[PDB]
Amino acid sequence: SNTLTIYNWGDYIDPSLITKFEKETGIKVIYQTFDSNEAMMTKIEQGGTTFDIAVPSDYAISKMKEENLLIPLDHSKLPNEKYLDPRFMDLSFDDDNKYSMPYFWGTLGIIYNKEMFPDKNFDTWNALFDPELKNQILLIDGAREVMGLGLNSLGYSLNDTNKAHLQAARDKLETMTPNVKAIVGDEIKLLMADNAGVAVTFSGEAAEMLSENEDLEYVIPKDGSNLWFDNMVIPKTAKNVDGAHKFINFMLKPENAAINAEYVGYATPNAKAVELLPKEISSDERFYPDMDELNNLEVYDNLGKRMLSYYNELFLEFKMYR
């Protein structure tokens, strides 16, 4: 058809690139946001003819593969793939990029106000359980994120499928509850803006936050955290498959990738776009770390429908205690 329907995370594109795309292709873009991979998957699983593009994380791509929910990409319609950094390609969630193309990548970490907590060390997930942090923490509303930090706080993998370990992680996270002001998503950056003094959320949200408030700092705990990749896919709900390839190729153009990274604040996977960014952005090693610095991070795995649903049930219980 002549309409393209995009499903993406909240606060995760420069709207001016959608305008630019529409003007350049004559395609009309419809754009719906989601707040988690779990919400996105639920909707895509209902089927019908809905979305031409979705932007799932790593494990969700592998899960959507398992469910036969993705359309293989025509790489001949994607010549801008050559500009991507190969370190972000051919990763185990989507071998040979058969189904997906890198959008943004990042980490998970702690954003804290250095003036509020000058005596604290957020180098460990265990700093978050300090009883001086009563009602101080804004936690990302994400099951893999929060179960993962609970597991990591115990010294376990964020992909642990030992049920005894998962129950231990839920019990641990219960002990954090007095320190939790709210469990929220995109609101965090606004709630922390200097218009609670600790947040756990994604690197790009932290980049935006730190740029507006000098007193904030972002640290990735040294006892392990998450490294993630969000990639564009064409779900089987698609009607405008050609248009979808056009959008993907458009977003792989370096000037578009640079504009997007500059506006949104997340790290680009596009090796030519990095050059186009202002050096104050690209030189920031909290957001553009050296690959050695990432050697203690773990990428979420698709644990299967049953175990992923159990993570979701445990996270929901944590959410309900309070």
Domain locations in the chain as residue ranges: 1-105+229-288, 106-228+289-322
Q: In 3D, which of 44, 46, 53, 50 has the Cα closest to residue 17?
A: 53
Distance CA 301, CA 160 (A): 10
The CATH number that domain 1-105+229-288 falls under is 3.40.190.10
Q: How was this structure determined?
A: X-ray
Residue 137: both structure tokens together: 């923490």
Residue 24: both structure tokens together: 């350049």
- Determine contact, residues 302/59, Cβ cutoff 8 Å: yes
Distance CA 320, CA 308 (A): 19
Diameter over CA atoms, the chain:
59
DSSP state of 266: P
Please state which architecture CATH assigns to domain 106-228+289-322. Answer: 3-Layer(aba) Sandwich (3.40)
- Determine contact, residues 128/137, Cβ cutoff 8 Å: yes
Distance CA 301, CA 4 (A): 30
Beta bridge partners of 118: none
3-state secondary structure of 52: coil
From residue 187, give the alpha-carbon distance in Å to each of 2, 39, 166, 261: 34, 17, 28, 20
Distance CA 71, CA 248 (A): 13
Distance CA 257, CA 282 (A): 13
- Tracing tokens 């707040």 back to the chain, one arrives at 35
Burial class of residue 182 (count of CB atoms within 10 Å of its CB; 0-12, 13-18, 19+): middle
Distance CA 106, CA 289 (A): 10
- Please indicate if the annotation marks 59 as binding a ligand: yes
**Same topology between domain 1-105+229-288 and domain 106-228+289-322:** yes
Residue 256: both structure tokens together: 């578009």
